[PDB]
Amino acid sequence: SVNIVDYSDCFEGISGGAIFCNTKNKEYNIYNKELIETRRSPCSTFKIVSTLIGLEKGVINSKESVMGYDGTDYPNKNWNKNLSLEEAFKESCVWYYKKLINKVDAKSVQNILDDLKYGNCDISEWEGDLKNGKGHLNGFWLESSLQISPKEQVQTMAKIFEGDTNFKKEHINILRDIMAIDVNDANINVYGKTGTGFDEKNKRVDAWFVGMLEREGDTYYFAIKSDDSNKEITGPKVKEIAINIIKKYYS
């Protein structure tokens, strides 16, 4: 079942690991086991769960749902509008997801994380890593108190998308909808979300791509993670590595 594998050829000399799990036939493919078991901040990958929280609590209702943009100026052009759930997810729009999560009481979030077994489920630093100076552009899921391992990410993904949580199927399908990506291969369906952060304590990136793939009957849940010391390594870069792994070993 648990197969140690070597995907270093796809990592282009970047430090990281990967885990792919097929729950039907229990095949667990692990590259860099120590890293895959290490908890780190989820960064923007948490938007997968925060979207479901918002849908479940009725803060948002569909992929068109808006959060009432108030005119605040942001450097990313596409944050400066009353964007829908679908575009806020794809743009990783921090103000949208901060306003969303701050409409939900802390006990509801704690119980949902507990139910999902979401890493350390530690939301004690609700406001986030305020020492970085970024103020309200912060939260417990952004290089702060909440931490989860790549293995636990995969377990959470599988629980959600195999229908094993109490989240509504309608809401699960919205997530599938907005997480779908185009890999120029119609023979596989890939879904995911990136994450980018810098671990200031250890001087290492937290660069993520987490999601799942479907091809000809089988579904693999996956998490690819870099902990490189090179600050240029981002979520988008690790998503490229993930796509190379998928095209090479999961075709």
Ligand X SMILES: *C(=O)N1C[C@H](NOS(=O)(=O)O)CC[C@H]1C(N)=O
Report, in Å, the least distance between residue 189 CB and ligand X.
20
Contact 176, 161 (CB under 8 A): yes
Q: Binding residue for ligand X (CB under 6 A) from 88, 142, 174, 212?
A: 142
- Residue 187 found at the interface with ligand FYG (CB under 6 A): no
Nearest residue by C-beta to ligand FYG? 184
Q: Binding residue for ligand X (CB under 6 A) from 49, 196, 233, 241?
A: 196
Helices (H), the chain: 33-36, 47-56, 85-91, 94-101, 106-116, 150-161, 169-179, 235-249
Q: Binding residue for ligand X (CB under 6 A) from 23, 29, 44, 155?
A: 44
The owner of tokens 């270093």 is 8
Q: Binding residue for ligand X (CB under 6 A) from 17, 54, 119, 197?
A: 197
Report, in Å, the least distance between residue 233 CB and ligand FYG.
16
Report, in Å, the least distance between residue 96 CB and ligand X.
11
Residues touching ligand FYG, count (CB under 6 A): 5
Give dist(CA 46, CA 217) in Å, integer. Answer: 27
156 binds, among ligand FYG, ligand X, none (CB under 5 to 8 A by kind): none
- Structure tokens given for 33: 């086991």
Instruction: Count CB atoms within 10 A of the CB of residue 184.
Output: 6
Instruction: Count CB atoms within 10 A of the CB of residue 22.
Output: 17
- Residue 224 found at the interface with ligand X (CB under 6 A): no
Taking alpha carbons only, the member of 210, 245, 239 closest to residue 36 is 210
- Residue 243 found at the interface with ligand FYG (CB under 6 A): yes
